[PDB]
């Protein structure tokens, strides 16, 4: 895993 990309709005949603 590289960079420090921002997570999408729903990336933490089941």
């Amino acid at each position: 895993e590289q960079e420090l990309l921002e997570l999408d709005k729903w990336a933490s949603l089941w």
Partner: antibody, heavy 132, light 108 residues
Framework: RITLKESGPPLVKPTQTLTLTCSFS??????????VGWIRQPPGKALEWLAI???????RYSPSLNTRLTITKDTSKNQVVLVMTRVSPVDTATYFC????????????????????????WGQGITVTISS | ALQLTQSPSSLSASVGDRITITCRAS??????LAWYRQKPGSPPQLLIY???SLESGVPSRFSGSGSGTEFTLTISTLRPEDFATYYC?????????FGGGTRVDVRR
Amino acid sequence: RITLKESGPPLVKPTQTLTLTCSFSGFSLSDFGVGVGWIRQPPGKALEWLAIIYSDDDKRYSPSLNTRLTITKDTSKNQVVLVMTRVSPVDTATYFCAHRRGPTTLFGVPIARGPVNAMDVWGQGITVTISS
Amino acid sequence: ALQLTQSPSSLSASVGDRITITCRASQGVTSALAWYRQKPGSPPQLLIYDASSLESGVPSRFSGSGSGTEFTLTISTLRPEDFATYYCQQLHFYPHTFGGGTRVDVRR
């Protein structure tokens, strides 16, 4: 039942400001988590993600264009506006707006991420040329 | 940003053929991967969302698979309207990114 249409000038001069409008029907920017994004396609090239705005006014921009892009919305008019400042011929392309579904909800409760992973409905697209 | 490598870039096929297009992500995007079909002069059309879910109204000949970094779009039986360009897109990280595209033309 979802329809989106882009409107704007077909020709703009370098260094000027480009304003594109997306008018839609079939959904409401009031729908929980719904999003409207913009993608451009330069002559004979691949699709390029530009920005997205959601029902809660949350918004994101392509990092290499964040200083020139601004996205807004008016939920009572079913429209989303994309503003691009200091344009140049590199910006010549066909611009598309698109709808992104919100998560699955059960009686208003968000229960599944699934549906949000894609831009399910795209507008016809508007060709914009930047030249002096 | 997250790089998506679509391969092959170009593919030759015949009506009735079975083709598979791949997309590799420089890092895990879980299942946040969508596939689109774009015909000349038209806007992209959604085929598969969330890596393998078939979009409503899309012919059953289209299927998608994968999770993490490797994904594939498959068309069991190629139809004339399928000779076009296809794109993958990841929506797990910002900025959302599309693959370079895969054109599918008529073989001879």
